[PDB]
Amino acid sequence: KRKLIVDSVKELDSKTIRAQLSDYSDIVTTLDLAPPTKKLMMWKETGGVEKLFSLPAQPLWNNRLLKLFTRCLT
Amino acid sequence: MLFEVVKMGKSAMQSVVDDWIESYKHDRDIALLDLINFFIQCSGCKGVVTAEMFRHMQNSEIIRKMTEEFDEDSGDYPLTMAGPQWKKFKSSFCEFIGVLVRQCQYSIIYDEYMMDTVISLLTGLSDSQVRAFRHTSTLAAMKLMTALVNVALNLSINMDNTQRQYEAERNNERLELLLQKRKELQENQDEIENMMNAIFKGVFVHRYRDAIAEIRAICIEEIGIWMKMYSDAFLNDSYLKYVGWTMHDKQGEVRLKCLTALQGLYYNKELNSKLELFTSRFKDRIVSMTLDKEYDVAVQAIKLLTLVLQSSEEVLTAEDCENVYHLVYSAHRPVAVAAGEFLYKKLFSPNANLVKTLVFFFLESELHEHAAYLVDSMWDCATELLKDWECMNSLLLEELTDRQESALIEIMLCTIRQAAECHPPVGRGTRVLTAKEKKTQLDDRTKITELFAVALPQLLAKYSVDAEKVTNLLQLPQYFDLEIYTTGRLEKHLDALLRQIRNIVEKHTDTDVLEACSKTYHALCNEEFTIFNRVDISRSQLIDELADKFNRLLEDFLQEEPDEDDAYQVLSTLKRITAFHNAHDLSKWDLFACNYKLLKTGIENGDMPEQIVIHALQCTHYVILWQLAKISTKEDLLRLKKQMRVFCQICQHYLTNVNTTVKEQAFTILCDILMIFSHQIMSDMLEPLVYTPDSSLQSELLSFILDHVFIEASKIEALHKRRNLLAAFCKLIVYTVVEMNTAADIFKQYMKYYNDYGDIIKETMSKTRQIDKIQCAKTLILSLQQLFNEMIQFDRSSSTFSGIKELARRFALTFTREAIAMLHKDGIEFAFKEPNQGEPPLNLAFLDILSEFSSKLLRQDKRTVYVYLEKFMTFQMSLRREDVWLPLMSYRNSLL
């Protein structure tokens, strides 16, 4: 059986184009917001499995204290 | 050979056309046949049309014959294959068609032979079900027609000139010549309008609505081209309507072409009344497309709307522009920026009133309560206004409603930050910065520093009473070059700053305000800038004051039963201290004594304000960590462990504290310390320091996780806390501070809590796989075992049961096969672990679960497993087939 592509149907019919006009809800969407607060903007930075497993549960503002933690990460 | 010559890309196209025209003049028939073959062979067809076929067969039977001898080996064809060889071919192919027509436009085109043949064929091939024909001929036909529109255009121009010539001669024999010419040109136009109508009604009308989206795009592309190139003949309703409909096409690429087509009818040229009625009919659908599911489309929808704005601002309503303004806060920078340029033109088209305009906009925005994303969206088009810090500064200082003041402070902060660190906010990134961009950076930082070294102290002075404002202003020094404090002769302003900071620290109790102060004082205490000492001295002096107010407060506090007011006093001062101890060394103040006495006095009485406990627990954590930093005595070394081990005890007591946020505070600190003093310390021998939790503590920590992390407004905040706790425990697992067996209670939750915790659990599984291929697979089963026993509160294959089996499939997908051997081993041992009365052994149904894991074996190992199974199953077990024994049959067939 031929690998040659052959189309059984070639046109969208006139009626379906009428429908396409009547309802475009399935090709439009809802607004995807960036982080709306500083809190959530920081969560998105230090969020993710990779950051979570590499930083303390109680955050450490000084790198001197931070390396005490990251030191112990094989 | 024509196909080949265009494929090879060897020569320029005008020379290939010209050679073809030569031969067409020599012998029409050979040349037309070679041309036919070209169009067929460009479709990937290996057949050839012979002279015999040409003279005799009609196109219908030629196409049929050429479908027969297409001789394809894949479903591919030149216009779909990828790589540059072919991207080039496509463009070469279309160049050849355009050039061929234009070269023929004065003569050959108007014979009855050449064009009619070509058009009738392309119309035929464009009707084929063979996609390679339909697609290739449609591209060819579309290009051909575009070429005719150009001939059509030249024609009308030649007509106008001839017509003007004719009228001028209204005064001999020349006149009859012009009349003749005029007429011949007119014949020529009608002939061209025919060919066009043939192609348009025979091809475009059908192919723009083709089942294949690539084909619909091809069509809409050229129709856009025609209306832009010859708008007087094509830019009207009768052609625009196809573009109007196709704007509703269910495929992104097709919708994108519709928008590109329209943009071409505004930029650079305006203005058409035809176009603006169309645009008015479809305005609603266009603004709706600014939220197209595909974002590439939504960008062009905004950009088109921006273009619309120019020619006329009244087609769009209030609500329309508002819907576009919303997109400045979009997650995706391209729509964000595009919407930003829309906003700019709408409302920002010396700087003061524009700065006030941005403030009003931001304040009327109910989507973001900070400015980082608004500013980033505007960064490209209003970079002059946004970096005008001197204007912004003057508005806050020199004689405006406090809400606007708050807002303007924020925007200023953001512009400063985006100019300082030279990257967009989180979620807006894509650099490794160019030459000129870090020149601008250095420029920006200097201007910021010079202005705000002086300005910030007055800014704090003015606004120190306002918590939110101050937190914002305090972020500033983190953004400027500090060499400029001395080389710039500015040290008196620095002292003003440190004074304003210290007054804030002392009168404020808000966590975020104090956090801001501490973090800034840490930015300034950088001992590679000469200023360190000046600022260090004020740090020393500030904390000297804090500790001493703390001690005095602690004397009266800990004996006289203190009420809510005494507590608020303690608390406040303790918060000021804890904040600073986080960022700063503070070792010189033996502060452990005060916090330990405050903590141990806490456990004994049980009525100690959560907040006082919490910050004390935090504070001690920082005292202990700070000693561990500077390690150099060997009694300092054992004194540390005295404090450390006792602090882990206090934490463990507070882990059962009735107060929930105290529990969680203790837990997180605990998970931190255990990780820090986990004997992964060694890199130098700090061997004494190691801490290993007794199994008592390990079970305490797991109970917490099961009670507080696993249990089913703004609850996303609550989820954040929970994930944080979970990862805090899973770090103990994957760095083996705790036995991997604990992960059993966690792995079983993978499907049940997949959206809250899925990825943290999944990372835990894999990080345990690289650490131990087999005991990971052992714990996977103990998980499935625990689920099984839980179900036992022995009679249905149910929704519950289907659950454990599904989870079993997901575990199976990870597993070389020494581990899976160990897995099937322990699964069998658990299946036959308990006996029945009137025998199948209890737990036998577990084989139906275990059967999920047998795919990932090999027949060698499968029978090794079978040999291990026969050590459990007996001959008459192998023979009592039904009922209630199918788990054993199915597990056995699973192997055989």
Side-chain angles (χ1 to χ4, degrees):
Chain A
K1 296 176 286 184
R2 307 280 294 271
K3 311 245 175 67
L4 178 75
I5 300 182
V6 186
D7 293 322
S8 172
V9 169
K10 304 175 298 180
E11 291 187 52
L12 300 183
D13 61 73
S14 122
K15 315 229 204 104
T16 73
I17 297 177
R18 265 171 269 198
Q20 281 190 348
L21 306 189
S22 314
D23 177 5
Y24 53 84
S25 64
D26 57 327
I27 60 166
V28 80
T29 178
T30 178
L31 170 58
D32 196 12
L33 271 196
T37 63
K38 297 154 181 288
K39 194 196 277 306
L40 289 171
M41 195 190 147
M42 186 233 302
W43 287 4
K44 184 179 173 70
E45 179 192 26
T46 64
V49 315
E50 68 293 338
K51 320 284 281 202
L52 268 172
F53 274 97
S54 50
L55 300 185
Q58 189 71 32
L60 299 175
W61 304 343
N62 200 325
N63 271 346
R64 281 193 66 196
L65 291 191
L66 177 76
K67 235 215 181 89
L68 309 185
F69 186 92
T70 59
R71 197 166 51 180
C72 305
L73 277 59
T74 306
Chain B
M1 309 183 287
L2 255 80
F3 165 62
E4 308 285 349
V5 173
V6 189
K7 181 186 179 171
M8 295 311 278
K10 277 160 27 233
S11 47
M13 289 295 105
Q14 187 168 300
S15 61
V16 192
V17 171
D18 286 338
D19 296 337
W20 184 89
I21 299 183
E22 261 181 63
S23 51
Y24 180 76
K25 288 157 129 33
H26 186 278
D27 187 347
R28 272 166 162 198
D29 285 344
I30 63 171
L32 251 190
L33 177 58
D34 287 23
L35 182 61
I36 289 173
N37 279 284
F38 171 73
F39 279 131
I40 279 162
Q41 293 191 153
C42 288
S43 318
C45 177
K46 265 96 187 186
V48 268
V49 187
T50 54
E52 183 66 10
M53 293 174 65
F54 180 93
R55 266 211 325 286
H56 294 122
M57 310 179 84
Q58 280 193 300
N59 286 339
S60 26
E61 33 252 16
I62 297 175
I63 302 180
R64 163 182 277 99
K65 175 76 176 145
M66 297 292 287
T67 313
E68 189 180 320
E69 279 138 352
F70 198 107
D71 222 320
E72 76 300 345
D73 280 29
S74 69
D76 294 327
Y77 58 74
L79 282 178
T80 43
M81 310 209 231
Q85 68 286 9
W86 285 122
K87 194 173 66 168
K88 188 54 182 295
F89 166 76
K90 175 164 167 179
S91 73
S92 291
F93 171 86
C94 299
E95 171 79 7
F96 174 82
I97 283 173
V99 170
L100 174 53
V101 169
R102 285 160 224 248
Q103 295 288 95
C104 294
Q105 73 172 287
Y106 292 130
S107 294
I108 288 181
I109 213 183
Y110 298 117
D111 71 40
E112 312 296 353
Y113 212 47
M114 185 264 241
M115 283 291 300
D116 186 12
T117 293
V118 174
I119 278 191
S120 75
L121 183 68
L122 297 193
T123 316
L125 294 165
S126 82
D127 189 35
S128 171
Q129 290 192 355
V130 188
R131 181 180 305 165
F133 292 154
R134 201 162 71 270
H135 178 174
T136 294
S137 63
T138 303
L139 188 69
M142 282 308 96
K143 291 310 172 180
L144 177 40
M145 198 177 156
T146 306
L148 291 176
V149 179
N150 202 120
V151 179
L153 190 37
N154 295 324
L155 248 174
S156 71
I157 288 170
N158 204 31
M159 251 153 208
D160 287 22
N161 288 334
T162 309
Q163 178 64 18
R164 267 178 308 268
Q165 215 45 63
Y166 174 85
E167 287 169 352
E169 292 245 325
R170 296 289 289 278
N171 304 334
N172 48 349
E173 165 64 14
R174 173 162 198 253
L175 201 69
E176 299 292 304
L177 289 170
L178 299 191
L179 204 70
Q180 182 55 34
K181 190 190 201 240
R182 183 144 156 280
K183 161 186 161 185
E184 283 169 344
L185 291 185
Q186 186 46 267
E187 288 166 2
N188 280 225
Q189 217 178 40
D190 297 331
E191 182 71 17
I192 291 304
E193 185 148 13
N194 286 2
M195 301 174 190
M196 290 197 315
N197 209 260
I199 292 176
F200 186 81
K201 282 180 190 164
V203 184
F204 178 83
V205 153
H206 304 287
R207 273 327 104 221
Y208 86 91
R209 74 215 266 171
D210 201 270
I212 311 309
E214 199 170 342
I215 291 182
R216 295 203 296 283
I218 282 183
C219 284
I220 286 303
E221 187 159 22
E222 294 306 296
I223 197 159
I225 294 167
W226 306 334
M227 303 180 285
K228 151 147 142 177
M229 152 169 29
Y230 190 172
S231 70
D232 309 78
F234 287 88
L235 176 41
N236 61 87
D237 185 28
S238 74
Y239 287 93
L240 277 176
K241 60 185 198 209
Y242 300 95
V243 176
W245 299 335
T246 307
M247 261 183 2
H248 303 75
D249 192 80
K250 248 63 174 144
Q251 289 293 300
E253 300 209 319
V254 185
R255 296 202 296 293
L256 185 59
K257 286 333 211 346
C258 301
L259 293 174
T260 283
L262 273 42
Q263 289 169 348
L265 304 179
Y266 283 90
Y267 173 74
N268 59 322
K269 297 180 56 176
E270 67 185 87
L271 189 158
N272 190 320
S273 48
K274 222 61 178 55
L275 184 59
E276 256 168 21
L277 250 66
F278 166 88
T279 285
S280 75
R281 306 190 184 98
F282 286 109
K283 175 229 71 182
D284 291 277
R285 171 57 186 146
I286 289 174
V287 330
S288 100
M289 263 183 279
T290 64
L291 283 163
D292 194 281
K293 264 215 174 70
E294 246 184 43
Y295 297 115
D296 293 25
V297 181
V299 172
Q300 306 310 323
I302 295 165
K303 288 186 149 313
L304 175 76
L305 288 173
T306 299
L307 280 177
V308 161
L309 218 63
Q310 296 160 212
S311 66
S312 41
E313 314 90 39
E314 231 48 78
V315 271
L316 307 179
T317 73
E319 212 216 322
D320 291 331
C321 304
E322 201 62 28
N323 286 338
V324 185
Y325 296 153
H326 285 3
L327 300 177
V328 177
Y329 301 123
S330 171
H332 318 279
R333 193 167 187 273
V335 352
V337 158
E341 200 178 297
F342 178 84
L343 172 61
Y344 192 63
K345 298 184 58 187
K346 201 52 170 42
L347 301 187
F348 300 78
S349 293
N351 284 350
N353 57 317
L354 277 54
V355 164
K356 298 200 64 179
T357 297
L358 184 53
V359 169
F360 275 79
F361 177 69
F362 174 50
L363 276 178
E364 296 203 343
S365 304
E366 276 281 26
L367 279 183
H368 275 30
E369 289 174 342
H370 61 130
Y373 291 109
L374 162 56
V375 173
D376 177 45
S377 303
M378 291 295 233
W379 199 253
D380 293 329
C381 57
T383 200
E384 60 286 353
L385 167 75
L386 291 181
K387 290 190 185 178
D388 188 14
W389 298 295
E390 205 143 24
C391 173
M392 270 186 294
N393 204 88
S394 302
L395 268 102
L396 292 160
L397 291 188
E398 33 173 333
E399 296 89 18
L400 50 89
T401 81
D402 316 284
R403 194 194 185 216
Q404 302 165 344
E405 286 185 330
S406 207
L408 167 62
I409 277 179
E410 175 73 50
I411 296 174
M412 191 166 72
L413 167 67
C414 297
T415 57
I416 278 174
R417 179 175 56 211
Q418 183 137 13
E421 49 191 65
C422 209
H423 62 82
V426 64
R428 290 280 182 96
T430 76
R431 309 175 159 176
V432 174
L433 211 152
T434 192
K436 311 301 186 60
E437 281 169 356
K438 36 191 183 163
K439 176 57 199 300
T440 306
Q441 197 192 341
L442 175 73
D443 289 4
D444 283 2
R445 304 192 69 122
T446 49
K447 180 174 258 182
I448 285 180
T449 322
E450 288 179 4
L451 166 54
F452 283 95
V454 184
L456 176 49
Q458 325 177 38
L459 280 162
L460 286 170
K462 179 157 169 35
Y463 297 107
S464 55
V465 59
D466 317 279
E468 334 182 28
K469 300 197 180 53
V470 155
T471 307
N472 270 335
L473 287 163
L474 282 169
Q475 317 294 337
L476 289 168
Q478 313 177 359
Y479 294 109
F480 52 60
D481 178 24
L482 295 168
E483 304 182 359
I484 301 181
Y485 257 50
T486 43
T487 76
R489 307 282 310 278
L490 284 163
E491 310 82 352
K492 301 183 188 152
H493 309 281
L494 172 44
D495 290 320
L497 176 49
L498 308 172
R499 249 194 316 288
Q500 287 305 312
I501 294 177
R502 292 181 358 223
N503 180 252
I504 290 165
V505 175
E506 288 173 342
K507 69 174 151 190
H508 275 284
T509 67
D510 183 343
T511 283
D512 293 324
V513 181
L514 302 163
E515 167 173 358
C517 295
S518 181
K519 265 159 165 163
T520 304
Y521 227 116
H522 178 264
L524 291 174
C525 268
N526 196 357
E527 56 169 3
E528 38 180 351
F529 300 94
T530 154
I531 66 174
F532 171 94
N533 264 282
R534 332 179 39 101
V535 44
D536 180 17
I537 288 174
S538 284
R539 171 166 75 187
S540 282
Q541 289 165 356
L542 170 61
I543 293 140
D544 271 335
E545 299 184 33
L546 276 173
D548 290 325
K549 177 164 175 60
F550 196 27
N551 296 351
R552 293 184 289 114
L553 268 156
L554 281 173
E555 292 179 309
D556 203 316
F557 188 49
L558 307 176
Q559 49 184 26
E560 202 218 278
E561 292 147 349
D563 65 333
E564 69 274 8
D565 293 1
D566 286 275
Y568 188 85
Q569 286 277 301
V570 176
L571 179 43
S572 299
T573 307
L574 163 63
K575 296 177 78 138
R576 309 194 175 104
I577 287 190
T578 310
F580 266 94
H581 214 319
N582 198 324
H584 305 290
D585 209 315
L586 301 221
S587 308
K588 318 190 332 172
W589 300 258
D590 184 270
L591 262 165
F592 179 90
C594 340
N595 288 319
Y596 174 72
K597 181 145 53 165
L598 194 47
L599 280 166
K600 99 189 194 304
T601 197
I603 324 183
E604 283 291 348
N605 222 15
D607 49 344
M608 176 75 50
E610 65 195 323
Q611 290 308 311
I612 300 182
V613 174
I614 280 176
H615 285 94
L617 272 160
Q618 276 176 56
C619 209
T620 311
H621 180 54
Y622 303 136
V623 181
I624 295 171
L625 285 208
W626 267 120
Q627 320 206 32
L628 172 56
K630 46 174 165 85
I631 265 176
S632 277
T633 337
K634 262 58 205 155
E635 198 281 325
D636 288 343
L637 191 147
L638 45 91
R639 189 179 47 84
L640 178 59
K641 266 195 295 179
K642 309 179 191 278
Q643 287 166 31
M644 195 270 281
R645 291 193 175 258
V646 175
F647 183 61
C648 289
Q649 278 320 295
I650 302 159
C651 283
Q652 188 183 313
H653 270 79
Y654 278 111
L655 198 45
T656 65
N657 182 292
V658 354
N659 199 293
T660 171
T661 68
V662 177
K663 284 187 181 89
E664 299 163 347
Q665 176 59 91
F667 177 82
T668 55
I669 283 174
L670 224 28
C671 293
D672 265 22
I673 300 168
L674 293 185
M675 255 301 302
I676 283 168
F677 293 90
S678 81
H679 59 292
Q680 290 238 345
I681 305 188
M682 312 338 174
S683 297
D684 196 57
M685 169 166 168
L686 307 175
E687 284 292 334
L689 292 180
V690 179
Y691 192 92
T692 313
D694 52 339
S695 286
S696 161
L697 182 57
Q698 287 182 54
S699 74
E700 268 263 48
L701 295 185
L702 191 59
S703 286
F704 182 88
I705 292 289
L706 302 172
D707 295 339
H708 293 268
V709 179
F710 291 105
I711 174 54
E712 278 149 350
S714 181
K715 29 86 195 194
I716 316 190
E717 277 164 6
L719 189 69
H720 184 258
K721 164 180 77 180
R722 280 198 309 274
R723 305 186 93 237
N724 184 48
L725 299 151
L726 184 63
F729 190 90
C730 291
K731 283 181 290 255
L732 299 175
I733 276 167
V734 304
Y735 298 116
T736 49
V737 186
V738 295
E739 57 177 304
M740 199 180 292
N741 287 67
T742 61
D745 298 68
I746 287 162
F747 287 159
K748 54 180 192 195
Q749 309 282 7
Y750 178 66
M751 278 313 292
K752 185 181 166 167
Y753 289 73
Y754 181 69
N755 313 279
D756 287 18
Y757 306 135
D759 60 353
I760 291 170
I761 287 168
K762 178 199 171 313
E763 186 68 15
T764 302
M765 286 184 217
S766 80
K767 287 306 279 162
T768 40
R769 113 211 122 133
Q770 317 166 191
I771 287 303
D772 192 5
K773 196 82 76 178
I774 73 155
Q775 202 193 0
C776 180
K778 296 182 72 61
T779 46
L780 294 185
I781 273 297
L782 176 58
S783 283
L784 294 157
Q785 290 181 208
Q786 285 173 9
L787 286 190
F788 192 80
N789 307 325
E790 282 156 22
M791 162 170 53
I792 256 54
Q793 291 78 345
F794 299 90
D795 302 276
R796 228 288 176 179
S797 179
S798 60
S799 172
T800 286
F801 190 77
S802 308
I804 306 179
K805 264 165 55 185
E806 173 60 15
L807 176 55
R809 185 178 55 82
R810 301 228 200 255
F811 282 171
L813 298 183
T814 87
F815 310 162
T816 79
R817 275 130 203 107
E818 193 178 348
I820 190 173
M822 188 52 48
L823 178 142
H824 284 257
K825 161 162 168 182
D826 291 322
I828 288 172
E829 291 177 68
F830 171 83
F832 298 106
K833 154 162 176 167
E834 295 298 317
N836 206 320
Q837 179 52 28
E839 64 253 44
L842 250 37
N843 293 328
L844 188 68
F846 195 70
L847 297 194
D848 210 317
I849 288 166
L850 197 39
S851 149
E852 296 291 347
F853 293 91
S854 50
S855 311
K856 284 291 173 85
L857 287 165
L858 174 58
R859 311 235 86 99
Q860 305 176 325
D861 297 283
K862 281 200 181 74
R863 203 177 283 212
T864 310
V865 152
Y866 198 108
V867 161
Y868 193 79
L869 174 60
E870 266 193 352
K871 302 163 187 148
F872 293 85
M873 81 163 307
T874 63
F875 185 77
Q876 186 184 241
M877 271 184 51
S878 168
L879 282 187
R880 203 176 3 273
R881 238 193 74 181
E882 194 108 16
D883 238 290
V884 188
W885 288 86
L886 288 77
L888 182 60
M889 301 171 39
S890 287
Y891 181 42
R892 233 173 62 242
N893 292 127
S894 147
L895 302 156
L896 310 168

